[PDB]
Amino acid sequence: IVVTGIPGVGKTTVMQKAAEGSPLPRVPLEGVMYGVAKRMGLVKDIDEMRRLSPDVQKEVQKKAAERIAALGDVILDTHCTIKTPKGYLPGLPRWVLEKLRPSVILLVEADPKEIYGRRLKDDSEEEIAEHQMMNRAAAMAYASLSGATVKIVFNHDNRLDDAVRDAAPVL
Amino acid sequence: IVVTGIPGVGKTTVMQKAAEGSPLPRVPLEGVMYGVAKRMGLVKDIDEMRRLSPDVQKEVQKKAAERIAALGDVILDTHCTIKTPKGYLPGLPRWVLEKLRPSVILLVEADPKEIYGRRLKDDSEEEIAEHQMMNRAAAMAYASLSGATVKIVFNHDNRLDDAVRDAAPVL
Amino acid sequence: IVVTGIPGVGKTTVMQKAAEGSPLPRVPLEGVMYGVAKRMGLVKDIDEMRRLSPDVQKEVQKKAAERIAALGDVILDTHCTIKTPKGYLPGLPRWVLEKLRPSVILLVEADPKEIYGRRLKDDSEEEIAEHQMMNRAAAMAYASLSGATVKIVFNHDNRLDDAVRDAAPVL
Amino acid sequence: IVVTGIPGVGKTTVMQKAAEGSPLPRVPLEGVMYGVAKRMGLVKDIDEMRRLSPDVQKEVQKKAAERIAALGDVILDTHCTIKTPKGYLPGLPRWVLEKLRPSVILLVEADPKEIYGRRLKDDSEEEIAEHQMMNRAAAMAYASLSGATVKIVFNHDNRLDDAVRDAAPVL
Amino acid sequence: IVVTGIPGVGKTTVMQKAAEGSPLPRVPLEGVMYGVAKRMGLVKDIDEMRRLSPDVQKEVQKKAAERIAALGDVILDTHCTIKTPKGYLPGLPRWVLEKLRPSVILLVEADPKEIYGRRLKDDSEEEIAEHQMMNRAAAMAYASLSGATVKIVFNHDNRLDDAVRDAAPVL
Amino acid sequence: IVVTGIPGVGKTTVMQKAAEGSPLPRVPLEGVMYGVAKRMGLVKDIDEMRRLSPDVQKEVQKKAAERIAALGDVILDTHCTIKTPKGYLPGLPRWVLEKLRPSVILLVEADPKEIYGRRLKDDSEEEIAEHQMMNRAAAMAYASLSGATVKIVFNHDNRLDDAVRDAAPVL
């Protein structure tokens, strides 16, 4: 399983509540990549992951995915697209999907005005709505490459029980 | 050619009225998969297609696609995404497209309020509008994998002649 | 399965109604032969099928039948005898039957006066009655060559429900 | 880099203003395909590129992409989807992406009412908004296949400096 | 890392609070064993893990530990001793330690009267104090076999901030 | 095609106007050399091209020319002679011409008094007239080595339409 969401949507809260009583392991993909790179001796510190040569970083992604595939059924956590100075970056290249072979991609959503409120209490609502629409396109592209199912989960501010009630049927 | 649409959009009516006088054979993909599985002795009854092992079901899709490719130019019929308890399932995995190599994907649409009306006379309008948006994303992803052209056809309740007039130029 | 009938008997209507909700593919044999010849590069236009050398046309029939046999169980559609300036031409030679191996030949019939009325609103009644008798002889010859069953279906003008009720038991 | 947009969005103006003082070469992809086909002796005139056999045209796309990859870092120019009588055609098939391996896809946008105004001074606003949405789906599918980043640039009528200020950070 | 504790000591709470913001993956060992056995086809349901042949269960433990060792630095979770009708069962046999090679064993403790209070609000205090003493012996035996460090963390009812302040320095 | 001119003659403006709507790629030679050296890992920044060993810089010129020759018909851009502290440097050595095999060298000119006016608004008129004469000698030497044609184009201050009308016939 892969769980995904825009920064501010409350991804970790819904995942922690829905995964309660589950026998499934819980895995941040960036953490595994750092662990694999560190045990291969390529890095020592978490920021060095951004300094690696891109074509070495492809093989770190490949090896991390092979090892998560060997672990078996898992709640993997990462962004589906990351916003950057040069625009949106796909969080899951084809060479990851060919190794992981996900059964489900789960996408968490809330209203742009709710997310803007949460972010202000910590982009325009138009840029939030854009990043959400780009995530839907990215998820369905990942699905078509892999045979993975795509689930959308709403997580409105007052209504965490709805997000958990929609998420738990997937597990 | 592949023809696709959401349940209730009137797909079969537009397909048969546009295919009138065409030399092209017509084919339901699920029906051919059942036929191939049955002639390979893997099943006897239509429900058993849901009971097959997924990694056998991949090869049944592959063989059905190879045989529909050997038949040549055809009006193939299937859903582009199927709604399920775990969310949207891609109806055409990459291993189907690499065998069929479609020249066109045709997508049928109507207003969510019309579709809700037809369904009530037999999901919310928002979930209908979502499933349409997910189908557009799926179709263009399938196109990029294959070189297939993508055509959208409107099929408003009274206006079947517009749908048929838009469809016939494709054939 | 093969469905057959004299021009004007309403062949397509009875097939379309009885095949409703069937998982079977729906194939015109002339269309397959054109598709096979076109993809073998032998022709580009449908009228060129009448211009092919007869011993090439035998192999086009043979290859079309092999590919329909690979597709498996199907509602195939063609005439059992075609009327021509030199008289009746058999629609299905032995080299087709040895490949398709049909389980059923279905023959649609109506009164010569009904057929003459339909044709007048679009041959003598004696020539219509002759062509029907020649079709029965052709069907039973095909049966004896192949082990196929032969079914006769009446389709009187008002009584389409009787034609469909006789046809549906075959499917 | 690849730069893309709908006809009327002002693609060339934003490209040439942002590329001012850049050491990067600029390349029209259709122009290179014509050049490669012409130097391979396949054509003499630009219109003959539409007359080529599709499976030859795949190899021309492949060879043009290999040569543009060997040139190195470049501002490549083409449409991401081309509107045709049979609907939208993908501008960049997978066999192009596996050769070019783009670092960025850039997508230029403007309001449908602005584009309709420019086109009227030279589709409905609904069909313009549709073609833009189909381009977003195409770009993100291309991204997932390649690891390319996706940037969106607004180019409103009076506001060319905003388009150039968004574009220059990519180069 | 391995985190361990007696049922009712609040193990999961202190782990969740201390692991906050860590890049380390989180793994229940029983979950991995079920996943490995399920993917090896040995079982389908979680209760069948108790029905396996003991010498198969040794090899499942061995394979699960090899796959966790390949994943690298991790917050592993399991009991150090499990209470059963036949008395205490060691949670981590030598064939697990030779694969995992832990750097730390972490042992969570609370007063027998606090644990009795938590268990009532849902063994004698003597049997609780015995099970704690047997865990200390088990942990220090595991340490001597492996070179792992052993840390004890108090988790008194109101004082969760002390438990988290002691746990976070280990990570 | 190669376009050439003295700094201040307005080379880019005449090229940009004449090449309007051309299918030809547009290429700065210094940019390609930097791109080739950068992708060979020899440099990271544009100024390091002056720091290269001359006998490496020859092979970079050779490889850049081979890759621009593989690209086919092109509007290449560079100076025909570069003024330096040690005098005039030839912009195109024999080892470049043997690879590019130009069909045309185009040389842009204006009155030394006009150029001095432009350079004042941004050498003596005698030194400007000298650099032009040295460019004519260099161009005709390049022609004799290669079989390239030589075209001279005037670009007087107001008369850009005359310059573009002389340039466009070459393309």
Author numbering:
A (entry chain h), B (entry chain k), C (entry chain r), D (entry chain o), E (entry chain d), F (entry chain w): 1 to 122, 130 to 178
Provide the publication's sentences verbatim.
Here, we develop a general method for designing self-assembling proteins that uses predicted structures of oligomeric proteins from thermophilic organisms as building blocks. Of the 359 identified thermophilic trimer homologs, 191 yielded high-confidence AF2 predictions [predicted aligned error (pAE) < 5, predicted local distance difference test (pLDDT) > 90]. We docked these predicted structures in the so-called “I3” architecture by aligning their threefold symmetry axes to the corresponding axes of icosahedral point group symmetry, using the Rosetta SymDofMover to sample the translational and rotational degrees of freedom along this shared axis [Fig. 1C, (27)]. To evaluate the accuracy of our design method at high resolution, we used single-particle cryoelectron microscopy (cryo-EM) to determine the structures of one nanoparticle from each of the successful PDB seeds.
Icosahedral 3D reconstructions at 2.5 Å, 2.3 Å, and 3.5 Å resolution were obtained for I3-A6, I3-D12, and I3-A7, respectively, allowing us to build atomic models of each nanoparticle. Comparing the experimental cryo-EM structures to the computational design models demonstrated that AF2 structure prediction was quite accurate: The all-atom rmsd for a single monomer of I3-A6, I3-D12, and I3-A7 were 1.3 Å, 1.7 Å, and 1.4 Å, respectively. Aligning two subunits across the designed interfaces revealed that these were designed with high accuracy, yielding alpha-carbon rmsds of 0.7 Å, 1.1 Å, and 1.5 Å, respectively. In each case, the rotameric states of the interdigitated hydrophobic side chains at the designed interfaces corresponded well with the design models, as did the polar residues lining the periphery of the I3-A6 and I3-D12 interfaces. Several of the polar residues at the I3-A7 interface adopted unintended rotamers, likely due to small shifts in the backbones of the loops that make up the interface. Nevertheless, essentially all of the polar and nonpolar contacts at each interface recapitulated those in the design models. Slight rigid body deviations between the building blocks added up to alpha-carbon rmsds of 1.6 Å, 2.2 Å, and 2.2 Å across the entire 60-subunit nanoparticle for I3-A6, I3-D12, and I3-A7, respectively. We found that only one of our six designed nanoparticles (I3-A7) successfully secreted from transfected Expi293F cells when an N-terminal signal peptide was appended, so our subsequent engineering efforts focused on this nanoparticle. Second we circularly permuted the subunit of I3-A7 so that its N terminus was present on the exterior of the nanoparticle and available for genetic fusion. Third, we engineered an oligomannose-type N-linked glycan into the I3-A7 subunit, as these have been shown to improve the trafficking and immunogenicity of particulate immunogens.
